[PDB]
Amino acid sequence: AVPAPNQQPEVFCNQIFINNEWHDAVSRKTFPTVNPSTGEVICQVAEGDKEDVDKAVKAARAAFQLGSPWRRMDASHRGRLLNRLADLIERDRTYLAALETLDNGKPYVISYLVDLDMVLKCLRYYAGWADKYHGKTIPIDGDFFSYTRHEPVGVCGQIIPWNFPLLMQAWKLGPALATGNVVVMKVAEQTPLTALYVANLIKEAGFPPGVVNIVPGFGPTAGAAIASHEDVDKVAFTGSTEIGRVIQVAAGSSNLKRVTLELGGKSPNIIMSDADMDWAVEQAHFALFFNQGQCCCAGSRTFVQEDIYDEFVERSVARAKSRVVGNPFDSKTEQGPQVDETQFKKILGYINTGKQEGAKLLCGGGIAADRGYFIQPTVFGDVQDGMTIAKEEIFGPVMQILKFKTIEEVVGRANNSTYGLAAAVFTKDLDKANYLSQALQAGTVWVNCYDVFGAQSPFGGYKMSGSGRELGEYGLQAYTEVKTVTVKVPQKNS
Amino acid sequence: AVPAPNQQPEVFCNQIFINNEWHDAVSRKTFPTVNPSTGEVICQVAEGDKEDVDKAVKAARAAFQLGSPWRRMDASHRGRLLNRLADLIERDRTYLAALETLDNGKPYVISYLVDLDMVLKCLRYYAGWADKYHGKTIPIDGDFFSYTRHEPVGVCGQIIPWNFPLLMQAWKLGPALATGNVVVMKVAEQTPLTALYVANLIKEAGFPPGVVNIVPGFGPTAGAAIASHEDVDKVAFTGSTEIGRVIQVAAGSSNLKRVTLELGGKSPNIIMSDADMDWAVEQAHFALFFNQGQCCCAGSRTFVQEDIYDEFVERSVARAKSRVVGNPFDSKTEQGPQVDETQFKKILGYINTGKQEGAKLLCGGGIAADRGYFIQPTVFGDVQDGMTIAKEEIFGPVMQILKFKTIEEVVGRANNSTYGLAAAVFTKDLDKANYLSQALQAGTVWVNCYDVFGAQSPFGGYKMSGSGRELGEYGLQAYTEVKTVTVKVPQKNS
Amino acid sequence: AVPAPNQQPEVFCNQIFINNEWHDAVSRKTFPTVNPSTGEVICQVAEGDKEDVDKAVKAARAAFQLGSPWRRMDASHRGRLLNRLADLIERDRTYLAALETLDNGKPYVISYLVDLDMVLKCLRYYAGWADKYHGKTIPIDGDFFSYTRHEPVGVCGQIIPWNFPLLMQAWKLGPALATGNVVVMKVAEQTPLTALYVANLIKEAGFPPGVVNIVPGFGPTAGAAIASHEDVDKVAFTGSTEIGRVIQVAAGSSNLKRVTLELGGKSPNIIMSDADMDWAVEQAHFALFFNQGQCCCAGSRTFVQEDIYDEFVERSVARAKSRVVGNPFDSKTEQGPQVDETQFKKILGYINTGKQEGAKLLCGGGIAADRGYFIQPTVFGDVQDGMTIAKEEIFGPVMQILKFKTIEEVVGRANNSTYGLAAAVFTKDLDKANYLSQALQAGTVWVNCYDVFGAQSPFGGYKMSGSGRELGEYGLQAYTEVKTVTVKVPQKNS
Amino acid sequence: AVPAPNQQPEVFCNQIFINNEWHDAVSRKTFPTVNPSTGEVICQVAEGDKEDVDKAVKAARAAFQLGSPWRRMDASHRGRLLNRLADLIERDRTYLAALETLDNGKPYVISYLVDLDMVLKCLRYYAGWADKYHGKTIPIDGDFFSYTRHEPVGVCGQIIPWNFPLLMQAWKLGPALATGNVVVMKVAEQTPLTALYVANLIKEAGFPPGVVNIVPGFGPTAGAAIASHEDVDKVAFTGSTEIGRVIQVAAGSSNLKRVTLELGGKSPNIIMSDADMDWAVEQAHFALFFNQGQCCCAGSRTFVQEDIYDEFVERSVARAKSRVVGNPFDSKTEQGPQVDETQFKKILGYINTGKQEGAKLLCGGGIAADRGYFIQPTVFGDVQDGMTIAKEEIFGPVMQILKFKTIEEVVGRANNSTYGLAAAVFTKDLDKANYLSQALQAGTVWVNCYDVFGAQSPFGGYKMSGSGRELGEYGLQAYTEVKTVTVKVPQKNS
């Protein structure tokens, strides 16, 4: 029941969003955005700069002053504003899905049924938490009355990736606005249009000026300026590991602001010999090739027991060869183009390196179309732990299948990594499922499923995959600082 | 590593415990306690009366007055007192286990390794919750500061059964003293000695006078007096369904005091065809014959699929025939005598009725010894749902095995009862385990185990098995009334 | 900004609401509803009966069966349905306010700005809690994995009073539908129209058939049938103490169903000599004369220190004499008529008895209009604790002012009652405020304010004022039964 | 009731504690510890090095492996071990207090009645949280069963300051061992003996080898090695701001390990004109001169309204001049010597700079004794915001009194700082207290009290004073990583 899409929607939101008004860059420099399906320029977006970041941060700080309309606003009213924003987004669902498809390149059906549905669910979920994050009345010793108040941390600088523009923007705006903070958001240079349109919808919803500010920046300049600003109380970053380390170093060296990181990973996928063959094959294919493999928790490493290795490999190759690649607006299309040329060339180089290392190429391994950044679904068999493709995040539609013999060995091999963002287990035995769920050192473990993301369930990673959580009640912890008030009383009684 | 027991320990605590002092009954009437292993009288215990209950309630109310030492005491100090009581109980572990064996009749090894260990664990667990039951700072609308304070409900009247004297006494004293309440406890007429010795230990521990009061009463007179007293803010009862209904009616007609009930049940046990045969048989035998079958959550109904019915029945009969019955102080003894003559005759009548109804008698079915209340382990096969033994709680060492064909049918048959205290599932499939755990209408569901009781895990029952919970954090809810305080502030800010 | 009201709105919802359809009474008997402002009949409403209650309970049980659309519905979808119902109610806000004014008699401005605003706030608040009531993963000892699941209790029978039809209906429907229960509601015979229109809106919102059922019954027959039905898992009652005791006795004697009571009270009001005179006088007048004094937590007892007794009495008399009584639809009207003739005559008799007992009559004390149930604002001075008016709930616009000398004496006198529903303290000292808030034995304590009701803040009473809470997170506890699932694991690790 | 102290207790614990065994430094280098009361050397302590840190971290990682005794240990058993450690510490309370006095220089009465009492309270409090930190069973959408498990973060490197050796060591060990982590602790070079004796007591208590490891290091070498080690999952630091920034930078550049900081502050103290004069003066004196002013939350800035400035200044000077300085083991002694010569010279330089800036010297300002690091109590009046002493943390017995006129001005001046660790308000008005508690940007706010530290109440700071909390339930969050497990089920029901 997908409505008819407009393949070339109009683009007008291309400036910096500050104080519920659109301002051009101080340097007047603009950067172009490229449609990945065809390689042509969609529109020109103003390039964020350090001075623009300073203006946005000053506006946010002014909006966060004590006694301001945002600070005096009731929590239930903040939830009502979030619900109003969600309703406004749902009103323009078709246009937002079309713009997301045009800018990112993901299939329109996926954008309409998955991305925007999850955005609405996340916004409406964090609308509820506005007036339900209670404190505590501490029963301290002596004739004292102690209690804790949950207060907004302050100005929050948020940097979102390009794989899920709307979804990550919702995940960042939900808890921040629910807890009463002000946001100075930096969007990815690849996909800036959807965030700007959402900012216009935010202005329409009725948020006070300066609460939400979006600065579209082209490069690490705006991100570094946000992470190094003194008035930014907290910085939240989601992206590559190197940029995350740079942001953390800059934040620690600037004002010791709170830092929350959500980096990439090398999430494994374990298939036990007793698992349902068809369901396991389909779920592994979906886990690896979802969003053209541009997922932080993609199941790149697929561990299959020696008993069912041959049949699983054959079924996976057959399924991958039948995947449809083409124009995302087409109904039959299952895989769209890559986000940009850089990722296209990086994935091609990764495929070439994997072929050089001796991994068996089962299918794909080349360009899918002469125009656009389309890559054929690639599957690598007989992959070893020493191979580069088995250790680095390809971040593309490349499948690697590894063989294991015993459960202890597969646990040791899966946990032998610097990333613990996610993991999966496919089996029908209760004991094996429990043991694998407990032993695996992953932030999220899925049993007989994959990519089951809910706003209620927190998401995070161990080791160097990041720190903290971004979903559920745990997400509210990062955007809140606890204040303890102790009052002397004439006499305390139980 | 069980220490050498004293088969005839001295009994001196046989009076009413009020205000940390021992008082005789006002009417000077005493009731005898009978050793179940031999049928002889152990000692004479003063019989509780309505006037004695009034004296105990007056003492408790005096100890609960505002500004009293108990009310002004810090929560951490209450936890320290609970830990001190637990240490004192552990110091006299051997004597308490011997007295429990002498009075109840359960094996000494069980009393030392299971009952007292669980008592210590429960006391030390509820010691921790003394200063960790926080309130909430409600984020109400408007310029108001609202918060909730958890206060003791008041004088609590508690009636404990005879199957687990020490364990039920600990389960009742833990949350009540942890939340800062005063206790007026009524103990079972069958096993009153252990509770009185524990009361003496409570006096030694250092509790303020009047905090804990124990009135040993012979019959429903003391229980009715406690449940109908006006100064009793809350009544907690654990026992038969009829007495629970009477207590609830009296409490509702007296002063609308809060009532918490924990009645018996007819907990089923389901064995799937794919379950581990040896483990399932052993766990079913332990589930049904634990504590001579005198358990509220005994797995009386054993549902076995038609595929493994014959082998399971044969193994269960073989295991039951090998059970050792004899003197509880003997090391090799596995089953002791019944609590009293009334239960002995009731179980004999139930066995006779089951034989009359046409159920196949596999083993046992008669008296085990010429002296004492010993009953042979009885197993009934080919039991139908219409049989009386399949519907009423025998509360004895009688095993009933029922046959089922499909999982939907077994769910419908197991849930077709007025009791939902507990249930069990034995299987190796994940989907079957999850579906059975979700479908069964039981307060507690065990998978591949039984009688796994932890102080942390709450315990309760659905339907007419009772209301509320007695373990874990949920146990603290019943013994606490919430007070909300709202204060007008000059200006509220997030 | 109150829209123009329709003084005589059309009435069409006058039948029994079962399975999203309107059915006449089986006996075809109808009872009339009387407009309190004029004494004329508004419409004829079908009279509920035991057979109709049985039909509604059967429909609710059918809708609550495992696998039904309501049971399989996601929690977030239940919250969305609640939000949709709130939006539908807000769409017809003017008509609902006009009908509430026509049926109850409260001023239209109050109905539009207070009652319906609170109804919308409560519904939207309990919409949020749909998917945020998590369980617990208990860390039990041994190689076991234990967790708790919060499940709906089942069919809930709810009886609502007549003072706040829409507000109490929302307070009952919020948590019940949020936790996934089915409702069989019994409405007051005085004000049945608004609940039926809300039921029609519920049908329009999209709830599955049988989830919500409303049976308008004339008398205690329907209430007794609901409280004594075997398929009703939980009964919630809000009203007089005697009917609450009867309901509790019947429920305990029928199937031991869970009972939650919210009865009336004699809430005191304490004015300290250092309090702000104008604010204290205005808040006391609002506390006592709100909703024509037809509030369960009305500040009937007004304790004023001897220092400011004369000035407070003079100001209270002056304020009471200036209160406007007349047609509720008039803008200048501040007090409407009483709910029915019975309350009118009872309040007149209470005023006569208070005059006979020797209490000084300061103002009012008679009928306010020759047509309708209008009573002049009455104030009684020099009231003693032994007077009947100082002990019984008049439930009308009668003010009683009592004098106290010391804070300990006023605490002792205020707590010397069988009701603890609410209390208030007016002062500027921190120590006095804290001591009074801690010492008073009231379910809710207000400081320098009164009737500050928020959906987030729980509401309840001590002693015989009721049991349990109806607002906030505490409200969800009553409509939920906890199931514990313990699974044996091969090996447990921290 | 302070027992007789041994002024020169024996010192034997002077090595590195690894695997429950004492090992000398690999380089065999030892650093001396100096008694502050006399300036003589107490004993020689082995100097920690990077290689020793590597050995300790390897031992901790070995003890943290899956299936190890520490990992398989029950949570209740961890709480029991913590309680056993607390009991062992209480057994040697006198010796520990004497050693603390000998090494730190604080008065023996303070060490016995305050420091060790708080250590015991903290240990026994965190013993309770061992088996009470539940997870959540997330109600996710779809046919899925999702839940969260709280797991230990891993090897934790902890660096403790010298002002409160035992208290900070307990604050670090409590949550870390309660949540099931392994500790590699670095102690201050000034006071290493007490931590080593506590480590010996830990070995005696029965902790498995490698769970707790203490490396006494002389300088930033050991701290940098701990913060830069790859196997250290989390680092917790408490000390100066510069070292905290260095540690955060190193941790971010090494492996992105979680960092928790608790730095110093410039906590203000506000005295309103209506506050109790005697209580305010005494509490301000205690707040500033507690522990010789070597407190992170010392009330250095004392804001006094112009109405009571003169009387408050006179009373503060009179109280400060009467403070007793001398040998800490003497009963009449109220203030001991400084921790070391460096702090002595820094405080002298700060006093000289304050005198140069034009601040009025009221009393003190020089050396108190010819032997030892004793400083006279110094009070500075007419202090301005531009003065250096009013902005930098003197960390000594220097009092600064500032004058303010209005409440808005004092709020603006108090919040105009880079530190928000703590604040205090002294008044009798309710509105002023609430407004000041809400407006002040401090981690902890005290009303009519100061330094009211309870294990239950969390402690932290805003701005650059640190991040996170170290006490209460909030303390457990830092030492725990959340794992989410989602399992597909055949059919989900509410």
Numbering used by the authors:
A (entry chain C), B (entry chain B), C (entry chain A), D (entry chain D): 24 to 517
The authors write:
Using this approach, we were able to simultaneously identify and solve cryo-EM structures of nine different human mitochondrial enzymes: short chain acyl-CoA dehydrogenase (SCAD), medium chain acyl-CoA dehydrogenase (MCAD), isovaleryl-CoA dehydrogenase (IVD), delta (3, 5)-delta dienoyl-CoA isomerase (ECH1), aspartate aminotransferase (GOT2), glutamate dehydrogenase (GLUD1), mitochondrial superoxide dismutase 2 (SOD2), catalase (CAT), and mitochondrial aldehyde dehydrogenase (ALDH2). Functionally, the three acyl-CoA dehydrogenases—SCAD, MCAD and IVD—are involved in beta oxidation and amino acid catabolism. Finally, SOD2, CAT, and ALDH2 are all involved in clearing toxic byproducts of oxidative respiration.
We collected a total of 82,360 single-particle cryo-EM projections for this class of protein images. Based on these projections, the BaR methodology allowed us to construct a high-resolution cryo-EM map. Subsequently, we were able to identify this protein as the ALDH2 enzyme and resolve its structure to a resolution of 2.66 Å. The oligomerization domain (156–175 and 503–511) is a three stranded antiparallel β sheet. Presumably, residues W185, N186, K209, E212, S263, Q366, E285, and C319 are engaged in NADH binding and C319 is the catalytic residue. However, we did not observe bound NADH in our cryo-EM structure.
